[PDB]
Amino acid sequence: QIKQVEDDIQQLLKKINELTGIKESDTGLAPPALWDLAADKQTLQSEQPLQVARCTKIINADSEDPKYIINVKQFAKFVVDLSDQVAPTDIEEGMRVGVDRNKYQIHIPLPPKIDPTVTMMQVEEKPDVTYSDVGGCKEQIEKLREVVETPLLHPERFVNLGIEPPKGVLLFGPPGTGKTLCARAVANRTDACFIRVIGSELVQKYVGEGARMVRELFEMARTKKACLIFFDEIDAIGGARFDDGAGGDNEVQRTMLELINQLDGFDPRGNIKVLMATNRPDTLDPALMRPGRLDRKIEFSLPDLEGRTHIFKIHARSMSVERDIRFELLARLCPNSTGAEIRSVCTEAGMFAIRARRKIATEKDFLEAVNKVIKSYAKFSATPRYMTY
Amino acid sequence: LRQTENRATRCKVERLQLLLQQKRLRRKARR
Amino acid sequence: AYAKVCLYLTSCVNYVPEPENSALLRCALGVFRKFSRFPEALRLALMLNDMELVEDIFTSCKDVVVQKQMAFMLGRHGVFLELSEDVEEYEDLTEIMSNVQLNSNFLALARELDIMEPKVPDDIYKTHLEDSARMNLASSFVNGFVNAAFGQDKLLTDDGNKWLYKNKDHGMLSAAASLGMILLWDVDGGLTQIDKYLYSSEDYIKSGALLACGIVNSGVRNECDPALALLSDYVLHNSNTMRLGSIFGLGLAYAGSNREDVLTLLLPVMGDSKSSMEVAGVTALACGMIAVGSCNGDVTSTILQTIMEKSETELKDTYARWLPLGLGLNHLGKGEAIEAILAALEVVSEPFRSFANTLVDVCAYAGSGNVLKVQQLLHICSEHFDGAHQGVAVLGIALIAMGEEIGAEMALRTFGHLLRYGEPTLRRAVPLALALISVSNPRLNILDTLSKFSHDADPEVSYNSIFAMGMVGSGTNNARLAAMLRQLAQYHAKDPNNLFMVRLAQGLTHLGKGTLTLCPYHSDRQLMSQVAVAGLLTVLVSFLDVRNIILGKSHYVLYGLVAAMQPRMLVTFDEELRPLPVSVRVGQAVDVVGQAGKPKTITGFQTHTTPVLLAHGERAELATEEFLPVTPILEGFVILRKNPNYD
Ligand SMILES: Nc1ncnc2c1ncn2[C@@H]1O[C@H](COP(=O)(O)OP(=O)(O)OP(=O)(O)O)[C@@H](O)[C@H]1O
Ligand SMILES: [Mg+2]
């Protein structure tokens, strides 16, 4: 009777759909559970649409009946007045006025414009990485934790001593040392607005578009009460300014200068704390590296023996390794290696076991993995160059 | 009324906590 | 052979009609006893509710260590066996059954995973990134929930009269019982603090401290009887003004004990009729909590006489819902037997019928999974009166369907459709039932639906949805849910009547900083805890009417929620009850179900040293074959022996 049961189950599903709502996703429609037609009719008959304009000037701002010069974007500019439901103080000379049609007056104050590209940068889903997934950089974790979390968690211990906590960090180190890993850990552990930015995301085709979105990013952060920004791969736009003779890097230098002025200029930067992740901290501009903008430069040097042993432990926690581990032997056997190298060694040990069709990875498998990842791949390593860099 | 109840509770809860202390002392002595 | 049999019998028991479940359980128990798997036999006996068989198996067990681990399991489930004075280590087994040393073990896990630093309500609120008596009540509630079972805090353990006086009216009771729940689980040395508070000139404060004593003794079992004394001394003669704190504290303190002395002390205060309807309801509730599952003729009879005696308008008035609730708690999970009570209630009164009948029926068929019963409930749901029976009926579908991992999700779908096609009362109730069907079990459809309907226009549906989402997150402090609750606080910043619920959800989510679980079931997803389900059903039936009970003056039911507070624990012990920190791996569930493949293989390996704070649905197995576990399933406290075969 099994097939009869499945046939009945699917027929029942088909009937439930046919009588409740089946398929409406072509025109992005919703399931009919949350369909408040009674409310939406009153919405369309009682809430008139409002065209978004900008209040340019307030003629006769005194208590006398004022007049506001609005500029309905790309439509027209008008002299208008406020709705009797809107208080005069709720509207300034730069807010998005939000005026109705038909004697453009039914006002709703409206926040600053944010580019969709910039606003699609807040970290909504927090990374699944924690501070316990980072090993061999205890002091770096402590310093980064201080700077980014501790003021945002217990500000009393800072205002008691009257200290301004450092607001700005530069995580710098060779390719694969825990820079982006620690950024993800900070994003996961932080209760605040985390905004990730990628140096390549500030390269835009039209002059003044990189600086424009830097300004928008920082002013959105300012609108939010407690914000951590994280410029990863900051090498992209952050580079020492050189005159040249053909105007090279003028646009990227302009957006970098906008970032500089936003970090520390003729303005209180706000409650924004910034991270700069890089593996070439020798191109960054001296102004960018000034401790008024990057206060707490942190070096993610290649882990020492203890750090490598800890990283091996971390990456082999969930593996099916055998009794005797000798991860200390592995750490001494693969010096001047990165956490990326170590995780690859663990993965290759697991794959050697899988290829042999075993369910237990042994010390011989780990030694083969070290030979494959550290010795054979030694010619593709980035450390010999990026340690100089 | 209220004072009588309070004194009753005082003396009797002292007795109760004393009994609990004896119980814990017996447990520790066993341990 | 063994695996085939046992697994098929367990699954079929969960997935089979009523008449065959008992016989399948009998043969499963027989196979376990034949193959000499005593802990499995005990688990089957408990899930059968066969105290006689439980005693028989436990006494037949002649191994001291296995008997002690059985005692741990039975204490976690909640039962106080009256063992005779001739067994393997009588005193140790009896105290393990009584569940003492739980305070020390909980503190030890806290120290191993340092969480002893107090968290004030403002710390969880995080207002620095985003009133009056209502806010004081909410702050006290969340403080208590977060610092439950630690005996530590920063509001009340420090200067506490300031907090008490900042709280107003019933906020006094709220704060006092919040302190009680902070000192919960064997801080009976805290009788000192709660006594030097109840030595007070304020009636609310004194009664709240009495409730604090009761709740501290809740779950605890001490042969000194540290509750009956206080509770009787206060509740003997003053049965006119409030009495709710005292009665509720007694009930919460003793619960599954089912001690005739406390039964016969609670019955007369209910039957006197000189105590307000609130006291009568709370007394029936306390009787039910004390006797969660007995078929107790005395309790049943007194409830019937109370329902008959109370006037028609009194029954109309709320807080009468707790009398049939007490009767159901008495007839908890007993199944068909209730026919006599059902007929009696049917002949009692016409309009109160639907309510009392449905409540007792659902509370008796809890976990049965009777599809025909749920069909009767759904027909009652379809028939719209043009409501209280409607809400208790939706709660009934939840309560009866929280037994199968498939029926549970399908009942979630049914609840979604119920909200879609429902009426005011139906929609108001659905969130409570949808919380019951999943407690301390974050699920990314339950959370989404509750979050969506928190914003709903209906304020009471919003209340229930927010409390339900907090319930789902209970004891599982989660970044996503905490951020969601903070966002909801921002949303309902001005609305105090809803921001109180939002704050309550925040605290209940961060329960114990994250150590506990309000889920009624335990062990390995099929072991109903009668005390825990009684507490949860109490809280949710009270919430069925949220404005006049919780938002009014009856949050002692929120404090009764404590009846279901049990820890998510994996502490390991030596043969002589000593800590054994041992590497243990964790994961959720994986296997190949061929024939009867056991779902015991875990893939999310995460090596830990016990104590380990495992989450909902994660099975933790040993890291190495150096110790053998006496219990086949590693939940709660365990005793691990040294494998004589080889390290
Ligand atoms: N210290 C470490 N501890 C644990 N894992 C590490 C560590 N360093 C690197 N890893 C592993 O390497 C990856 C993290 O590298 P990450 O992305 O942070 O590098 P990066 O330093 O930002 O380098 P890049 O210059 O390539 O951007 C993850 O797989 C992580 O498991
Ligand atoms: Mg990177």
XYZ file of C-alpha atoms in Angstrom, chain A residues 19-20 32-34 126 152 191-192 225-226 317-318 323, chain C residues 126 128-129 420-421 452 479 486 605-607 624 646-647:
28
model
C -7.679 25.629 -2.344
C -5.161 27.838 -0.463
C -1.952 34.220 0.730
C -1.620 33.688 4.496
C -0.454 37.274 5.126
C 27.187 36.885 11.234
C 31.478 48.663 22.885
C 26.880 43.332 19.050
C 26.968 46.431 16.833
C 25.025 54.429 17.040
C 27.856 51.869 17.317
C 39.641 18.753 16.760
C 36.818 17.269 14.681
C 45.568 7.705 19.314
C 22.278 46.821 25.554
C 23.432 52.012 24.869
C 23.166 50.859 21.227
C -4.049 31.950 8.210
C -7.718 30.902 8.409
C 6.449 38.087 11.543
C 22.924 35.780 18.392
C 16.539 43.867 20.470
C 32.634 16.279 16.020
C 33.685 18.852 18.613
C 36.086 17.432 21.183
C 38.213 7.235 23.190
C 42.258 -1.909 27.240
C 42.787 1.833 27.585
